[PDB]
Subunit: 461 residues, 4 copies
Amino acid sequence: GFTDYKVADITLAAWGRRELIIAESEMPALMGLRRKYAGQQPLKGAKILGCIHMTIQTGVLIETLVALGAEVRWSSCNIFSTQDQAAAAIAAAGIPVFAWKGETEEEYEWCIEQTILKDGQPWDANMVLDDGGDLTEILHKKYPQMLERIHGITEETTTGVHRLLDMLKNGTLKVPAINVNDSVTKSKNDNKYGCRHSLNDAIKRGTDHLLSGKQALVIGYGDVGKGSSQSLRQEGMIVKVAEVDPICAMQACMDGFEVVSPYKNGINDGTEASIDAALLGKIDLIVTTTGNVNVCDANMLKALKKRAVVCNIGHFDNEIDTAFMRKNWAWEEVKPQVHKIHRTGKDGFDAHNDDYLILLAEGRLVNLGNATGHPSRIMDGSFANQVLAQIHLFEQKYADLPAAEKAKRLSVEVLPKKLDEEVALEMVKGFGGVVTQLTPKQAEYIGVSVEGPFKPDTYRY
Amino acid sequence: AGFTDYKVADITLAAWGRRELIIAESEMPALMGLRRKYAGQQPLKGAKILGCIHMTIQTGVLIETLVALGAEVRWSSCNIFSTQDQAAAAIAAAGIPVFAWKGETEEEYEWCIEQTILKDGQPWDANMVLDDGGDLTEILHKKYPQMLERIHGITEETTTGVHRLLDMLKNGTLKVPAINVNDSVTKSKNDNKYGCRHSLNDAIKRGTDHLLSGKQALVIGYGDVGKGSSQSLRQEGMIVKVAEVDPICAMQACMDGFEVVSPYKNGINDGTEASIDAALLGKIDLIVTTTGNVNVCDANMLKALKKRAVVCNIGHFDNEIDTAFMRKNWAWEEVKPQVHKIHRTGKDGFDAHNDDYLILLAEGRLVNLGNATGHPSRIMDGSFANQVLAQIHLFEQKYADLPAAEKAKRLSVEVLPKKLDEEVALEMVKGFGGVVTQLTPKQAEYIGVSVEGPFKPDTYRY
Amino acid sequence: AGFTDYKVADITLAAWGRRELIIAESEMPALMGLRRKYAGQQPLKGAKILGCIHMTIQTGVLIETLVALGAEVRWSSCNIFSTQDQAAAAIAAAGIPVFAWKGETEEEYEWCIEQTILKDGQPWDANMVLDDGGDLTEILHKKYPQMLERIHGITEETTTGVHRLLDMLKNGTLKVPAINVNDSVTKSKNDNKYGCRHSLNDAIKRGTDHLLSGKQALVIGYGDVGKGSSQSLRQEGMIVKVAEVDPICAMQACMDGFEVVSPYKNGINDGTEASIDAALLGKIDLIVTTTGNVNVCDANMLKALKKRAVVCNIGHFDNEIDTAFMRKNWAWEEVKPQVHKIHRTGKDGFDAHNDDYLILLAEGRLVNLGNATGHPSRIMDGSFANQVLAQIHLFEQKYADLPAAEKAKRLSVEVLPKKLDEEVALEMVKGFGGVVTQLTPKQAEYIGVSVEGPFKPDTYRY
Amino acid sequence: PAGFTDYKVADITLAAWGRRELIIAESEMPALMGLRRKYAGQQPLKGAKILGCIHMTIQTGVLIETLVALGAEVRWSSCNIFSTQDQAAAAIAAAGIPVFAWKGETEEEYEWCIEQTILKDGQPWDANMVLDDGGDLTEILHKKYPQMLERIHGITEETTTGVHRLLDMLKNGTLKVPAINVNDSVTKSKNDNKYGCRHSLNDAIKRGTDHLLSGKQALVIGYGDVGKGSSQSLRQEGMIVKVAEVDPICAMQACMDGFEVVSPYKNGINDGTEASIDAALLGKIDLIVTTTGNVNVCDANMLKALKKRAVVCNIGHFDNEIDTAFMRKNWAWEEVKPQVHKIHRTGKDGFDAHNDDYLILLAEGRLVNLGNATGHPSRIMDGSFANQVLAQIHLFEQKYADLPAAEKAKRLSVEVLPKKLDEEVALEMVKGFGGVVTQLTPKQAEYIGVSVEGPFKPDTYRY
Ligand SMILES: NC(=O)c1ccc[n+]([C@@H]2O[C@H](COP(=O)([O-])OP(=O)(O)OC[C@H]3O[C@@H](n4cnc5c(N)ncnc54)[C@H](O)[C@@H]3O)[C@@H](O)[C@H]2O)c1
Ligand SMILES: NC(=O)c1ccc[n+]([C@@H]2O[C@H](COP(=O)([O-])OP(=O)(O)OC[C@H]3O[C@@H](n4cnc5c(N)ncnc54)[C@H](O)[C@@H]3O)[C@@H](O)[C@H]2O)c1
Ligand SMILES: NC(=O)c1ccc[n+]([C@@H]2O[C@H](COP(=O)([O-])OP(=O)(O)OC[C@H]3O[C@@H](n4cnc5c(N)ncnc54)[C@H](O)[C@@H]3O)[C@@H](O)[C@H]2O)c1
Ligand SMILES: NC(=O)c1ccc[n+]([C@@H]2O[C@H](COP(=O)([O-])OP(=O)(O)OC[C@H]3O[C@@H](n4cnc5c(N)ncnc54)[C@H](O)[C@@H]3O)[C@@H](O)[C@H]2O)c1
Ligand SMILES: Nc1ncnc2[nH]cnc12
Ligand SMILES: Nc1ncnc2[nH]cnc12
Ligand SMILES: [K+]
Ligand SMILES: [K+]
Ligand SMILES: [K+]
Ligand SMILES: [K+]
């Protein structure tokens, strides 16, 4: 009688299992890790606190961690991103998981606490896997004593890495961490091509709007912004791109996009007069991709074309000033995670009012909120890096080191390029691709081993 | 008039070249912005630069920016087919020593580099080097090592030349510090990729006028040049297959919508005819090498290619294709300059109506420069603004005058600071009419950057 | 008050459906412009329309447009999986007879059509027909020919339906005139092509959540639906191969950048397993049928497909794929509604971890409507504005009131005039914010058109 | 051969180069060469004497020698002053074929060349067939040599503009011989007109200016077949492309294809005033391309409002799409190189060499793909010219000029080739790509109501 969980509906487990079995066929790098390390059990004794979107993809990651010896206790890192049939299957396997689609902010916090506490006392955790830094922050701020037993953190996403680096700079980071985000088989696969697959997916499921022929403004052109812009452009949208980074802006120009600012001459002085009203008045869809704060602000929201769609695909919802919209405009739910925002005011609304905006997933990550996030064959790359990161930090056993040996290892690092390449090769084989093997003379000519790595650490791909 | 310190194909093309120089200047905002900003200061006063890079219209604007900031130069091209003769003529007519013409022989190529090095039979008093591929660098280190005692730095343009510098650094044979210009983001991620996107299909069309839509291409390599080359062909409607040895680059080719194949069964290049995937190669209409490696389109691949396939290389050196094998065994028929039919029916003579032939472009030399005009001005703007900033930094450092302990700390191969990379990019963006947004103080603090930048950690790959 | 003349899944979905109808109205300017232009004229007053077409949100706006113009209707869906239950619910809640739900049996499908034809157990006094695919038209001609004596015309939505109409016409068995709505340019080259571009990858993602970039697709057919489908997949990064029997369409596939291949060696389908290009099919991750033909993904093809490939159909009827062979021979595992794993290991049982299976979507029925929502409102706006114009025209012509001698002269299958096609297109373009230029009198004179149009001869193919 | 001087080309020594490129081009034109091999034994054009007027390119060389291989005699000229490839003209003259064509003709030289085909040894040639591209030869015959039309069996016209001119003459009863509309074969219109311009428009702009196109703003006037292909030529290079149209159906396609549809005039109303120009819009355009076959679609007021240093070019058949006459009258022309001019908007008399207020005009407004590059590639022209050959055989064998008046009345029309021949051309093109077309089963052919051999579509089908 396993009861150490809470999900939406355990009877969805059989359905979840069916989709997990399909997902395993789509994740050869991760399943290959199961075969390669099975006999060795390299995570035997590992006790992992996990906080990441409880999708079918995360389900295969969890079961890969367990198959190598680990115990885990899991939550989602977003209130809307759980696939309830995935949570159900994991719970039915006898794995502690606290997650469902549509949590409140209170339930979100309570779910993280259930992974941290077992039977009212702190679990004897020794590893952390995190996506966005929320679980990392709670441990450091509320349970700092637990971190004295934890060998490391493996952090998934750009926002989480930035938070780790601030703590390292401030001397407040307690354990070593691996920047999983900056593997090329993560950042240049997950962040870019994943959003390419799943952004227009989420908009279609939410609105069923034709995108071809319409005008879109993508805020930001990093890895997420690049993939988001392509998601829309390949559908036939006329895509404009905003950036604060001139190098990323240069790439947008060369990639065939027009680079614009919401503000006249790019200066955001906070006034309505600074808004390029003629530009915003033409935009049918705006997507924030920055990891920054308030990049679709109240003045932009006021100036947007009637019936434009507004959504965010960065990690946190504060990219869009939804607070302003909750205070001043009336919200009409169309269906879960789809709201019309009536700009006529808060005192009710005319059900036939034409002056509204459509917000997706209440500003939360739209690909996971209104669809299913990245597909398995893309998450294969990210989560293979996660398993390798867990094994690397666990086998180092930072918490057992003499104090005079910890300082050398208290760091935030990426995986070595050899691991990056190993993950990439299994992905390529998954597509049926054939990689050419260098001859000894060719390897000597370009100064590499036939085994790799094939690029210096400076290389940007 | 009075000035004879040059050798170009035809000085009377100078007015035409000057007309195209004036057009190019309006297409190169970052390079002309540096010209205006530093003209008053003359930061290159006293610089004597040996330059070796494709003598194009774009290089002309580079050359005249350096002279406008106070430098004297002596110039040659780094390839036998890449010079634009009207550009060379306009430079020589401006009183600037230049030795370069389209269609040099290998002996003439070496002689041109030597005419920059030597003035009146003696070594010039050079103190700065600008190189593209390392040929000039190599000649100075091997044949004129005494000149390097007075040279303050090398600014190297391209991936192949940077590799040669890093081997010398490791060995302790590099005599002066270098800036890796190639690895500025406004170079590698602009020039190497987007440049080849523009000029690869440009060169193939000028050489053959072949329709590319619906035909089969094989791109060897998926680095920056291979990425841009694959897009150049795919946007024209080619069905593009990609070969790689780097599984990460291979992964990118898959996600970008390409089928990743190897010329060899299971990727094993064992040097036998039986290793060739003859079925795959018998279906390819166009093969392009982009690797910077050697013999990636070998003799057995050439024997296996579909009849009348086009063969070209867009990497720096021609040994990516085994053209030596073709000269030894097959008959060459010139369609027109830099376009040869290579008849696989024998070495001596050919039937004018033979159908078993390949079309080689630029005799295997860099095809975008050999059969067209290379990258466009607005792209070379970024590369060449980096070159000017690099020359300024190394000339002002005055390495050759530093104490030994200082020399040891500065003898390195380095890239320009990210802040300068961003400033080049900002001028490129404004050239397109783009508008970059300014962070609020709160937004800048939130992501931990100055409002002025730099906006990314040095680890960032873009 | 006490309306019971309907059958839907869940009437409590009505409020949800009305919210989505109000949104759809803002996405359909051509259809809503018709509603506003003709509302006061009431041109369909007296019309009684039997409607058989996918009971989607978009059909809801069509239904309420006809009612707003004066008509009474009785409605059913033309496919067992295409209904959106919240749309059906909203239409029923408005007091409009509708018999439709997602997931009907074949028996329930026929029953729903009969409920539109019969009111209180007797033939309804219908006088207009709106059909999509010809199922209702066929049932009327075969089982209720006396009702056709009072019917003024049929307006037929789709390619397969038009072909069935033209077959009846040449056989002298068609009883009332029809308008071919499919072949308006704002239908055929909008709906059939761009609609499938939007909704094909949409449905595959909802059903499987499979990554498409980098995998291999085979599209059977390259008419309007095949053109749109191939783009739906190529824009996602698939490597797409195209099969055709029409050499002109195949020519377009080549020029559009696709490799044209055949499931059969040398294109010859002799019925044996030996004719299957097994090498080609063993590399295919996804096959899509787009033909309107029969058995174009046959049993031998299904046997040769790569393990875990996806199989789907986007033509009108499920007989493009030999799903009957698979029901007879292989074991079906339901993943979720309209998604089945078909285990090629045998008919009786299956191993839950067997790797030799195919994923069939929507049991071979129209996949864009079975696994997603079909075309989006702004595309269906053009199709359904054409339907409303066609209904008005045939109802106003009053064919059924003519003497036999006059009926014979007007019995035919026609398309709408180009001037109307253009006027629908103008409202669509305005919906995007586009601005159409007006010819000067001298420009109009020069190319031989009127300033207001039509702008092209009837032979123009666009 | 010895004694042959009945030609006029730039440089006869270019013939060997031209022959080398014709031999390559034959390997790229399977549909045309298959017709040459199919009909060689029969000589279906023995006795044909063809007046030909079409761009004297390498691709036209292959068409000319196919016609001669099937028995025809021909006398040839180009249909544009800038479109001839001099090595193609040289190879044809050296083969003993009369041709009067060189790149860079004056208007006087152009008309002289057409007359040299019409006249042989000072008298009208006894021609009996016409192959035309644009209708200029057809117009000269009807207006200046009408008596020659009494012996001519037909005209085979290549392009949209020429077909419009033919239909105008038919409507007014002024057309004297029947014609085949070669343009509206699907293997012509939806191959040549669209995909040809996709290949060759960005080709010509790069050769003329070597400008980066990616990231820049383009305005394409028209979205017919040429405008569709032109817009793709630019968009696939990374340009931001806006599209202007008077036809809302073509405008609808532009929207659905992912382009923003705009007008040079406020609210699309062209009242002739400067105030009607959307000056903000045209002030952002780096490249304008006209594709309409209409008159003055890039007018003087538009040219005054264009962004500084914008490129201006036309890819429709005639140069009057751009008001170049206004520019000749008011602005100073600085030649960069042949077929590339800087137009200085600072005045007529003289210009500053470093002036920044200029436009770049390509090919002096003439069809830019043929003027600044080589036009469509051989594998595309294969389809158009296979159609031309079939059209010539049909009209010559019909022998219109030999029919009694009543039989002529039934035949005096402008027609297209049957779909079955359209399909047979497409099939050879597909095979040239290595494509494999599937054969219907008898049951399938019966299911959709076609023959296993085709035709596979009704005549109404638009593809
Ligand atoms: N939803 C998903 O599936 C998913 C996947 C990966 C990452 N993410 C999240 O998306 C966010 C972005 O990640 P990334 O990897 O692209 O980071 P990134 O650093 O590569 O890119 C962010 C970009 O935003 C730009 N930017 C910042 N402030 C801006 C402003 N005010 N206006 C315009 N541009 C501005 C920066 O210049 C930068 O180029 C992070 O929060 C990350 O965690 C989400
Ligand atoms: N022609 C131009 O305009 C131009 C511009 C820039 C650079 N280049 C030259 O092009 C070359 C490539 O430059 P880059 O910046 O792309 O370098 P890069 O290192 O980024 O890319 C080269 C790629 O080739 C691959 N490779 C090596 N050997 C291979 C083999 N046998 N088979 C398949 N793939 C193989 C490597 O894995 C690598 O990804 C260099 O010689 C450079 O100097 C030319
Ligand atoms: N699902 C949708 O939303 C939707 C929309 C419009 C039409 N349709 C349906 O899709 C079908 C196709 O419509 P269309 O307008 O594209 O028709 P079409 O006539 O334009 O195209 C069908 C194509 O299939 C080809 N074909 C026929 N038999 C073939 C075979 N054995 N192998 C390969 N190709 C073959 C034909 O040559 C033709 O080009 C019809 O059933 C139509 O009713 C569906
Ligand atoms: N250069 C080449 O290689 C080449 C090839 C084929 C045809 N052509 C020529 O190009 C021209 C166009 O041919 P096509 O086949 O595209 O014809 P088309 O009829 O298909 O297209 C012309 C389009 O221009 C539009 N148009 C007319 N006036 C306009 C205006 N004022 N503003 C905007 N749009 C306007 C029309 O609505 C029409 O859609 C003809 O002169 C033809 O002979 C040139
Ligand atoms: N499907 C997914 N599962 C987990 N994390 C994700 N991030 C983006 N997509 C995801
Ligand atoms: N959404 C939709 N509604 C009705 N008919 C359709 N046909 C295709 N998509 C449709
Ligand atoms: K997913
Ligand atoms: K250039
Ligand atoms: K829909
Ligand atoms: K050509």
